Amino acid sequence: CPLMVKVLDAVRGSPAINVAVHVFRKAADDTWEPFASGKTSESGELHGLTTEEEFVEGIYKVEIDTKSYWKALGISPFHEHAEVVFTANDSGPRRYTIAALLSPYSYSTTAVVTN
Amino acid sequence: CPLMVKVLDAVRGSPAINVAVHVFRKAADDTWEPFASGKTSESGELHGLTTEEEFVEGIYKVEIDTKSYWKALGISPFHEHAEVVFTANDSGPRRYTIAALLSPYSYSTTAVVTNP
Ligand SMILES: O=C(O)c1ccccc1/C=N/OCc1ccccc1C(F)(F)F
Ligand SMILES: O=C(O)c1ccccc1/C=N/OCc1ccccc1C(F)(F)F
Numbered sequence: 551c552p553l554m555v556k557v558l559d560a561v562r563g564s565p566a567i568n569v570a571v572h573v574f575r576k577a578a579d580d581t582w583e584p585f586a587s588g589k590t591s592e593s594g595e596l597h598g599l600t601t602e603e604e605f606v607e608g609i610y611k612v613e614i615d616t617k618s619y620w621k622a623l624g625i626s627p628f629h630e631h632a633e634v635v636f637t638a639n640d641s642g643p644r645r646y647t648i649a650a651l652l653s654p655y656s657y658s659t660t661a662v663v664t665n
Numbered sequence: 666c667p668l669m670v671k672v673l674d675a676v677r678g679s680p681a682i683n684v685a686v687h688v689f690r691k692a693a694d695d696t697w698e699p700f701a702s703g704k705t706s707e708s709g710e711l712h713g714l715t716t717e718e719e720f721v722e723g724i725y726k727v728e729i730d731t732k733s734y735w736k737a738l739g740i741s742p743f744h745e746h747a748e749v750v751f752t753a754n755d756s757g758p759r760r761y762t763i764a765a766l767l768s769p770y771s772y773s774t775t776a777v778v779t780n781p
Contacts, residue, residue, distance in 0.1 A: 609745060628751050628776045630724060635745040651773075658766075658773030661743040 552605045553586075553646050555596040557614060560653040561625070565594025569619050573599055576609035585610070611635045612648050620654050628655040636661060667720045668701075668753075668761050670711040672729060675768045676740075680709025683737075685730035688714060690723050697726060722754045727763050735769055742769040749774050 553573070557566035569590045574582040586599040612634040620627035634648050647662040668688070672681040684705045689697040701714040727749040735742035749763050762777040 628778070630750040630752065633748040633750065635748060636743050637745060653775075655778070656773065656775035658771065660771035663743075663770075 551597055551645065552602050553599050554648070555590070555599070555612060555614075556647060556649045557590050557594045557596075558649070558651045559594075559619075560651050560656075561623075565592065566590060566619060566650075566652055567592050567594060568622075569594075570615040571596050571599075572613045572615070574611040574613070576611075582611060605638065607638050607640050609635065609637055614650055614652075616652055616657065619652070625654050629657065632657045632659065634659050634661075666712050666760070667717050667758065668714045669763070670705065670714070670727060670729070671762060671764045672705050672709045672711075673764070673766045674709075675766050675771075680707065681705060681734060681765075681767055682707050682709060684709075684734045686711050686714075687728045687730070689726040689728070691725075700725065717758060720754065720758070723752070724750065725753050726750045729765055729767075731767055731772065734767070740769050744772065747772045747774060749776075751776065 555571050557569050559566040567590055572587040573585045575585045577583050588596045588599065590596050614632040616632050617627050617630050632650055643665050645664050649662060650657055650659045670686050672684050674681040682705060687702045688700040690700040692698045703711045703714060705711045729747040731747050732742055732745050747765050753761060760779045760781055765772055765774045
């Protein structure tokens with residue numbers, strides 16, 4: 551599993567469950583092509599988005615639909631979604647974890663790249 | 666000044682100086698149209714992007730060119746940029762500050778929204 555997404559809720563101190571996540575890849579014509587998507591599990595995690603052979607070098611965008619999450623909890627949010635745009639680089643055997651921590655008016659995101 | 670941007674560097678403990686910032690507004694046809702741009706000052710701040718009259722209700726995107734910033738320091742960072750997408754003035758006109766804290770493999774952003 552070369553690409554994982556983990557989403558946390560900073561208000562409730564819990565995994566952010568049932569959050570929609572969309573992944574896009576930049577095509578040579580500078581357009582976002584849909585690549586993978588899913589909803590976070592009860593652990594706030596989304597696995598199995600792609601395979602090693604499909605996950606090639608390129609520019610990727612991970613979109614986290616935070617607005618619908620906060621609305622379902624009855625909280626007025628600021629952002630439309632959280633976006634994370636990065637370059638996947640094949641230097642060696644690498645796995646990418648995109649982690650996001652969510653509050654109604656703020657979010658943080660980090661990339662953990664391991665073997 | 667209804668829209669300000671402030672950018673900090675978490676590695677050096679300083680304002681992030683000379684960072685390019687681009688603001689887009691979602692147009693009628695679902696396309697992102699250019700709205701304003703600038704560079705952060707020696708204080709890490711960017712003011713004067715727009716006026717109250719031109720900053721109407723809409724969906725806005727603030728793109729902070731973090732990659733160019735880290736590269737100029739010799740760091741190959743993870744993100745291409747930091748993007749912040751939000752609806753503005755949906756409840757009437759407000760003053761927005763978009764703040765971002767940058768590290769090579771991480772960033773955080775928060776909005777401070779005040780009523781004049
Ligand atoms: O990521 C991971 O492999 C991970 C896996 C399992 C459980 C927790 C984590 C890490 N979750 O990190 C949350 C986060 C995300 C973005 C910025 C800052 C944070 C902080 F809360 F850690 F500060
Ligand atoms: O910067 C400033 O003087 C500033 C100016 C106007 C409004 C708010 C602020 C502060 N903003 O707080 C930045 C910060 C601090 C600690 C963690 C994370 C952040 C982040 F917002 F950058 F993400």
